[PDB]
Structure formats: structure tokens, C-alpha cells
Predict the structure of Spike glycoprotein.
Amino acid sequence: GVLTESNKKFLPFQQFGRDIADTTDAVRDPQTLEILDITPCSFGGVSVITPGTNTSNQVAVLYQGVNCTEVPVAITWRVYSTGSNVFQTRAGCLIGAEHVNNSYECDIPIGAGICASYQTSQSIIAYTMSLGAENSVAYSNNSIAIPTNFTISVTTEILPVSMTKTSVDCTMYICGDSTECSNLLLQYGSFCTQLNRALTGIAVEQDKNTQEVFAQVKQIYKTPPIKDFGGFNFSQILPDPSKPSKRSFIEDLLFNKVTLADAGFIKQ
Amino acid sequence: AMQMAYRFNGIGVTQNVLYENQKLIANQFNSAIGKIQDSLSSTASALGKLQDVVNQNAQALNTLVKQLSSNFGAISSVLNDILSRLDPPEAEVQIDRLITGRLQSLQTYVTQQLIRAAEIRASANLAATKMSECVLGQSKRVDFCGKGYHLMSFPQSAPHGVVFLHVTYVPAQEKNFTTAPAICHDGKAHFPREGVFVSNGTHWFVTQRNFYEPQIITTDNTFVSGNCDVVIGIVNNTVYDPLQPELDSF
Amino acid sequence: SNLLLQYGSFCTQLNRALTGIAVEQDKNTQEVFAQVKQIYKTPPIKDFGGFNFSQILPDPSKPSKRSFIEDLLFNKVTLADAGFIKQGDIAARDLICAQKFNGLTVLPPLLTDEMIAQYTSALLAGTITSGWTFGAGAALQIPFAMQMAYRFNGIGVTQNVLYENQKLIANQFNSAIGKIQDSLSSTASALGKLQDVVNQNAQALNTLVKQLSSNFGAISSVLNDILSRLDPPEAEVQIDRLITGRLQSLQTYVTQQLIRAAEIRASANLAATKMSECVLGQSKRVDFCGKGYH
Ligand SMILES: *[C@@H]1O[C@H](CO)[C@@H](O[C@@H]2O[C@H](CO)[C@@H](O[C@H]3O[C@H](CO)[C@@H](O)[C@H](O)[C@@H]3O)[C@H](O)[C@H]2NC(C)=O)[C@H](O)[C@H]1NC(C)=O
Ligand SMILES: *[C@@H]1O[C@H](CO)[C@@H](O[C@@H]2O[C@H](CO)[C@@H](O[C@H]3O[C@H](CO)[C@@H](O)[C@H](O)[C@@H]3O)[C@H](O)[C@H]2NC(C)=O)[C@H](O)[C@H]1NC(C)=O
Ligand SMILES: *[C@@H]1O[C@H](CO[C@@H]2O[C@@H](C)[C@@H](O)[C@@H](O)[C@@H]2O)[C@@H](O[C@@H]2O[C@H](CO)[C@@H](O)[C@H](O)[C@H]2NC(C)=O)[C@H](O)[C@H]1NC(C)=O
Ligand SMILES: *[C@@H]1O[C@H](CO)[C@@H](O[C@@H]2O[C@H](CO)[C@@H](O)[C@H](O)[C@H]2NC(C)=O)[C@H](O)[C@H]1NC(C)=O
Ligand SMILES: *[C@@H]1O[C@H](CO)[C@@H](O[C@@H]2O[C@H](CO)[C@@H](O)[C@H](O)[C@H]2NC(C)=O)[C@H](O)[C@H]1NC(C)=O
Ligand SMILES: *[C@@H]1O[C@H](CO)[C@@H](O[C@@H]2O[C@H](CO)[C@@H](O)[C@H](O)[C@H]2NC(C)=O)[C@H](O)[C@H]1NC(C)=O
Ligand SMILES: *[C@@H]1O[C@H](CO)[C@@H](O[C@@H]2O[C@H](CO)[C@@H](O)[C@H](O)[C@H]2NC(C)=O)[C@H](O)[C@H]1NC(C)=O
Ligand SMILES: *[C@@H]1O[C@H](CO)[C@@H](O)[C@H](O)[C@H]1NC(C)=O
Ligand SMILES: *[C@@H]1O[C@H](CO)[C@@H](O)[C@H](O)[C@H]1NC(C)=O
Ligand SMILES: *[C@@H]1O[C@H](CO)[C@@H](O)[C@H](O)[C@H]1NC(C)=O
Ligand SMILES: *[C@@H]1O[C@H](CO)[C@@H](O)[C@H](O)[C@H]1NC(C)=O
């Protein structure tokens, strides 16, 4: 830590001052009876603000909870600390991003109302994001606005219903194929039974979730062979009988869009 | 068509609007459906919720697997290697260290899965409520079944999830009008039975609140209550009783 | 650190969990408040048919455009730390100096209180100037008397009742707003639902910090003195005891924080639903938007 002059008061021959976390906060010099307060030297997290790698390799770094005055103190890498790019934010001091006065809709959230984005040659800007367009509704005590037309707007809403059923064997996961370890683990009472009960409850609850969401009709209605629905066209959402799966065009699109390139089903 | 007229009456728009703009509404709905299919095909990040759920489950499982390769303070992370190198009375310490580490990993994984399952159960309860109140009905709740005045909804199956196509009625082309709370005809106050009084500059009409369909002010469009001097903002205008010219011709 | 390395990925697991909590906090705030993409503004002339919104409309006198009631609430609740980076709570203002030094910090919200107040101002101005139409599409202006008449027809009362009793209803509304202001200024625990959240977070952090003073079986509770007093080969076990105790402390704290964040997310979903159904429209659900006919 760092040592500094202290405005504290001590006993005639007191020694030091501890704090809440059982860490010494101040100390009296043994040689000369002078008191120093111990403040740990600067530390904090590091966040790297970047666009996509294909977009650019330029990055900006945010030293969280830190004014950049201790960046010259430790002046591992030090490439971007040349200066003229230092910006002070309430989320820490930002290095490598230009500050601009105007406002835009947020692209990369930094904190305390500051966002970063890649704009025009090309550089990373840091701005106080705008909450939205201004608007003064023409209110009057005798004026009204009435729609003379309309639009029919369809919007999507994706909701997760269930998740993957996983059941584990506690003993096998811990030390499968080990009699000595099986006997030793048996001394821990019923922990594996508790874990298996919890995971089985989750697995059954997944089926309950799916049933509650979907099985709300006891009769499987089907549309008539004549699609005379007043001109409305439901082909994209009605099932397509040609495919082996009796699901619609949009359903195929969704099932193809959801990718499991991670270890989800690759470990099948 | 009659179902959609029922929905229009549900949102406060007279069914004559649908019966006169059926072709336009069908075209708009078909265009919206095509736009949805294009967006779902070309977005590549639309199913973010389901993708995140799958990624979280996979990441938790891989973390649980990788925890099998940690010493947890023991001589080695391989139980067979520990057993071969050490005789059982001293090997029990290493085996117990591994047992504690692996059991702690299992407990952490199970607690995380319980919390995530609670989250998924909340989302599934929301999805069931949305199914019941949008697919099986017409919800008056604002922003529940999409933005705008909800009309009807379509469910679509998704991997470990559900997709709702919320069809809504959005007012589009506004126009300014001069309005009054009531009308003075013969010392009486006429309030709109179902609609709003609007002036196009020189004449006073009665219009439904959600669509400009001006109509002449009559005794059918309005009800009488009180006198003129009490209502703040009342205006003088003629209220035409259809029975009076009929008995004039009589 | 080397001794902790053999425990695997526990620290990165806890860091991921806490970061997820922190990001979903911003998600909750954005979901509740940023429900309008258009920042409406009240007209300079406040001719709202006798209704008085001055105590809920923003105050340009204050540097932050907060209403009188919003300022009352902010004075009422004494937060712990507002993300102020260290260059009557009586606990947190010194539990942000050493607590920060304990290798655990507090992040600032992405939306500043001024931005939250701007969302609130836009929502309230759009409401009082356009009824419920700004939540279904463009803001359609309408006199507030006629908007309230539409609300009366919604609750099943003829609009002639409002047009006959406009002065009385406006006076009652202003009196009720004044009563709310006086109750907020005089009360002690009306914002207890937020005070408990702040106190729970403070207690969790206090317990987590105080767990650094426990030996957990080691000779001392201070890592530096253990290392400076004993050689590595025998200090291994003392460091291991301290590591095990402090990892259990972090696991407990993070699990409690995850459960509490789930509770807060449920509350924020309820708040967003209440905003959508009560502020952006008129709700027929009984006792949802208050006691009575909404
Ligand atoms: C406000 O709405 C008024 C009613 O819709 C409208 O008055 C109407 O004006 C039109 C002319 O644009 C008249 O149409 C008639 O014009 C001639 C002369 O009267 C006739 O020979 C034709 O056959 C044709 O029917 C309407 O008669 C008249 N409405 C009434 C009830 O007399 C105003 O012009 C509108 N004003 C604005 C500013 O929009
Ligand atoms: C709506 O119609 C009302 C009734 O027709 C009308 O009230 C009438 O107002 C006029 C003048 O504004 C009065 O005429 C006389 O008023 C005073 C008497 O107080 C005389 O000194 C004047 O010289 C003038 O001759 C009518 O007496 C009065 N009618 C009634 C029943 O009180 C409203 O003014 C009309 N409002 C609008 C906006 O058109
Ligand atoms: C409805 O009217 C508002 C404003 O009221 C009118 O404004 C005058 C110009 C005149 O037309 C009078 O009849 C009214 O007093 C319109 O809002 C205006 O929009 C324009 C952009 O097109 C903007 O430049 C103005 O500043 C706005 N007015 C105010 C007071 O802010 C609105 O566009 C009108 N709606 C329609 C559908 O025409
Ligand atoms: C109401 O809006 C619809 C579309 O929003 C209008 O229909 C369009 O009309 C133009 C010509 O004015 C055509 O070029 C478009 O192809 C039409 N679109 C569709 C989807 O049919 C309609 O004219 C508007 N009606 C009024 C009275 O404003
Ligand atoms: C409903 O929409 C579908 C599109 O999904 C229409 O099918 C298209 O029809 C046109 C003209 O007949 C063809 O050129 C396309 O190749 C078809 N595409 C597909 C995917 O089938 C269908 O015709 C529409 N229904 C009606 C009654 O017009
Ligand atoms: C709305 O209410 C506020 C607060 O009650 C009113 O502000 C008062 O105005 C009077 C007249 O200038 C002052 O004497 C009071 O001191 C004000 N009170 C406060 C708390 O500042 C305001 O006037 C009301 N609006 C209208 C249109 O009357
Ligand atoms: C980061 O460090 C700088 C430099 O020490 C701080 O700037 C000082 O701020 C105080 C606050 O009023 C001024 O009185 C000093 O004159 C400033 N310069 C100095 C001390 O050299 C800055 O405040 C620090 N960051 C934060 C967030 O406090
Ligand atoms: C020890 O140091 C202090 C100040 O540095 C001095 O006053 C004192 O005389 C020293 N002790 C002896 C025994 O000289
Ligand atoms: C970056 O964008 C280009 C085209 O804009 C695309 O071809 C490339 O695949 C993108 N990078 C990645 C990693 O997908
Ligand atoms: C931003 O504004 C500040 C003062 O508001 C000014 O000193 C500075 O030069 C401005 N910078 C740019 C790039 O506009
Ligand atoms: C509407 O407000 C204006 C303010 O310019 C006022 O002159 C007029 O009398 C008011 N009308 C009503 C009906 O309140």
C-alpha cells in the first residue's frame, strides 16, 4: 500500500488502527512517534470496448473505478496510454476512445449514461447517449387528433418454455469405477440422493412447463381443404404436409435458425 | 372476415371499417407475414432467448465436466493415479479431498440449475398466460399481446420455446380537428353516445375515437343530459332529429 | 493464487454469475422505464381543465429534472453507493472505502438518475397530453377533460357525470395529490420496499467482508502474516484452510445474490407490466392499478 500523513488521533502510546475486514488501516512509525495511514495502492477491473473483429481491430479500454492519474503511476501493456485519448467517466477512466458532445442511441454500454461506438477515418467514439427523439405534443383544450387510416402490424415474441433435461449419477460423476471412493463417499450421508431428487424435479418440471404452454386444446382442430379465409393468407404459418415433419414454413425457419454448434447436441 | 370484424369491435373500431377495407387489411396482413418470415430468415439473432438458454446449459455442463480435472488440493486429479502411488491409509486423505471438491462442484451445478429452472418456469408461465390470453382470446391488456391494439395471435413452435405472432391494429394517418365536449341545441347539452365531436373548420360531426368516420350529429348519435350553462367548453350547433323532417313530410 | 488454481473454475463461475446479475439489473431498469422510444414533452401552457400536475411534473429549478415528489422520494431513501469512484446510513459511506479495498467493487448503473427522470417525464407528459394512444402508436393529443371523460366511460360511468362535476373532480384530484405529498414528506417507512433491498445488499456485503476475519482453523486470519511467519511447505495447509473458508463464503454470498436478483427481476417484471397496463392504458383488472375503479 501507500503511506501518507494522518489526521487521526491516538493514545499517548497507541500502536495502530485496524478496520472492519481485519486489515490494518493505519500504523505508528516505531522509530519516530509518527502515525501513517495505510491505503492500498490502486487496483480495479479492466474492460475492453471493441466492435467486431471484422469491423475493426481498434479497441478501447476502461479501467473500472479509476481516474487515469494512476495510469502514469504504473506507466502490463502500455501501448494506448500515450494520452490525448483519456476520458474520465463515472464508470472509470476510458483510454482509446474519442469523446464527442452530441448524443446517439447506445451501441456499447459503458455505464453512467456513457456509451461507445465505432463511427467516422474510422475511430471509437464515447458519448452521453440520447434517450430518444424529442417531441412536443400539440396539446390544446379544444384540439384533438384522430387517425384517418391504420396499419396491420405483426410482431414476434420469443419466450423460452423448457430447457434440456439433465440427470446425473452423483457417485459415478465423482469417482465412477472406484470401490474405495464409493465406500468413502457413502460416509457423507444423503447428498447424492438430494442432488438426484433436485435434478429429477427439474426434468419433470420441464415436461410440466411444455404441457402447460402447448396442451391447452383437447381436440386437434384442422383447417378445411379450402383456404377461403376472406382473403387472408395463412400459408406461412399453417403446417406444410409435404415435409416429413408436419410443421409450418416459419417453424422450419425457427428450427433451422436455432443453432447448437456448441457442446449442446454435439456431444450426442 | 366476420371474426376480424368481431376483433375490430373489440378494439373499439366499428365493423363497417373492416367490411369496407377488407382487401386492404388482407394485403397488409399478408405483407406483414412476409416481412416476419424475411426477418426471421435474415436476422440471425432473432431467437436470442432460446440461444442464450441453450448456451447457458451447455456452458454449465462443460464447466461441470472440466471440474473433474482439478486437484482440489490433492496430489493428482486422477483417482487411479492417486490409488497406485499411495497406500490406502494415507490415500484416503487425497480421496476425501477429491470427494469434497467434486461434491462441491455438483452442489454448485445443481443450485445453478435450480435457479435457472425457476427462471425458465417463470418464462413458461408467462408463455402459457400469453397463449391463453392472446391465441385463445383478445386481450385488452396494453403491450401484453404486442404493441398496439391487439387483434389476434398465432403460436409457432420453436426449439425449447414458443413464438407468438402478435397481430395488432396501429393507427397510422392522424389529422387535426377542433373538438368540443358537448353541443348546445335548444338549451340542452348533447354528449356523444359512442364517439367524439370534431369540427372540420365549419361543421360539427360525430366520429368514433379510433377512425375518422365523420357523421351528422343526430339524436341517435347523442344523448341529452342537463343544460348548457354547466359544461365547460360547450359549443352551439344544430342537432338534427330524423323524426322531425319525416313528420314534416307527413 | 497458485493454491487457489487447483480448485478449478470456481472464481470464473462466481464472476460470471455476478456479472450476469449486474447486467440483468440494467436490463430490468431499461425494461421498466425505457418503454417509449419518443421523448414527449409537456406544453409550456398547462391548461389541463383545472387539474394540477405541478407536483409530478419536472422541476427545471433543480439541476436534475425531477418532480417535487421524485425529489421527496430521493431524499427519503438514503442509498449506499451511487457508483462514485473512490479517488443516515452510518454504515455504507465507510463501507465503500475499505469494502472497495477488499477486492470487490460497486458498478454504476447504465442509466443515470437524470435519465430515469427523463423517462418518467416523457411518460407522464405523453400520458397527460395524449391519453393512452401514445402507448399504442403516435401520441394523439386530446383535452384532458375529454380524456378523463373517456376514462369515466371506461369505468362504467357516463361522461356527463364528469362534464357536470369537472370542478369537483379536479379539486379532489389536486387535494389527493397534496395528501400524497404530505404523506411522503411526513412518513418514515413508506419506501420500505426499497429500504429492505438496500439493507439486504448492505448486510450481504457486510457479512462477506466480516468473513475475512475468521481463521477457519488457520493460525491467523491474515494471509500476509501467515506467509511471513511460516515457510511455504507447512503454510500450505493454513493457506488451504483460509481458501476453503473464503470460497465457501463467496459461494454463499453469490447464491443468495442470485436468489435475491431473481426476486428483484420478478418485481421488475411486475413493475413493467404495471407501467404498460396502468400508465399507458386504463386497466379493467380489479385491484391491479390501485384500490377502486382505475
Ligand atoms: C367541412 O365539411 C363540410 C361538410 O362535409 C363541408 O361542406 C360541404 O362542402 C361541399 C363542397 O366542397 C358541398 O358539396 C356540394 O357543393 C355544391 C354547392 O353546395 C353542390 O351543388 C354539390 O352537389 C355538392 O354536393 C357540401 O354540400 C357541403 N356540405 C354541406 C352539409 O352543405 C365543408 O366544406 C368542410 N370544410 C372544410 C374546411 O373542410
Ligand atoms: C349559444 O346560445 C346561447 C343561447 O342562444 C347564447 O346565449 C345568448 O347570448 C346572447 C349574446 O351573447 C344574449 O343576447 C343578449 O344578451 C344580453 C342579456 O344578458 C343583452 O344585454 C344583449 O344585448 C343581447 O341582446 C342571449 O340572451 C343569450 N341567451 C340566453 C338564453 O342566455 C350563447 O351566447 C351562444 N354561444 C355561442 C358560443 O354561440
Ligand atoms: C397538428 O397541429 C400541430 C401544431 O398545431 C398547429 O400548428 C400550426 C402550424 C397550424 O397548423 C395550426 O393549425 C396549429 O396550431 C402540428 O405540429 C407541428 O408539426 C410541425 C412539423 O410538421 C412542427 O414544425 C411544428 O412545430 C408542430 N407544432 C408545434 C406547436 O409543435 C401537427 O403536425 C399537426 N398534425 C397534422 C396531422 O397536421
Ligand atoms: C390507407 O393506407 C393504405 C396503406 O397504408 C393506403 O393504401 C395504399 O394506397 C396507395 C395509393 O394511395 C397505393 O399505392 C398502395 O399500394 C396502397 N397500399 C396498400 C397496402 O394497399 C390507402 O390508400 C390509405 N387510405 C387513405 C384513405 O388514406
Ligand atoms: C399465400 O402466400 C404464398 C406464399 O407463401 C403464395 O404462394 C406463392 O404463390 C405465387 C403465385 O401463385 C408463386 O409464384 C410462389 O412461388 C408461391 N410461393 C410459395 C412459397 O408457395 C400463395 O399463392 C398465397 N395464396 C394465395 C391464395 O394467393
Ligand atoms: C399546483 O399546486 C402547487 C402546489 O400546491 C401550486 O403552487 C403554489 O402556488 C401558490 C400561488 O403562487 C403559492 O402561494 C404556493 O406557495 C405554491 N405552492 C408550492 C408548494 O410551491 C400551484 O399554484 C398549483 N397550480 C395552479 C394552477 O394553481
Ligand atoms: C483523480 O485524480 C485527480 C488528480 O488527483 C483528481 O483531481 C483533483 O480533484 C479535486 C476535487 O476537487 C481537486 O480539488 C484537485 O485540484 C484535483 N487535482 C489534483 C488533486 O491534483 C480527481 O478528482 C480524481 N478523480 C476523482 C473521481 O475524484
Ligand atoms: C533511535 O532513533 C531515534 C530517532 O531516529 C533517536 O532519537 C534515538 O536516540 C535512537 N536511539 C538511540 C538509542 O540512539
Ligand atoms: C465480418 O463481416 C463480413 C462482411 O461484412 C463477413 O464476410 C464476415 O464473415 C464477418 N466476420 C465474421 C467473423 O463473421
Ligand atoms: C465539447 O464541448 C466542450 C464544452 O461543452 C468544449 O470545450 C469542447 O471543445 C467540445 N468538443 C467538441 C469535439 O465539440
Ligand atoms: C382554451 O384555452 C385558451 C387559452 O389561450 C382560452 O382562451 C380559452 O378560453 C380556453 N377554452 C376553453 C373551452 O377552456
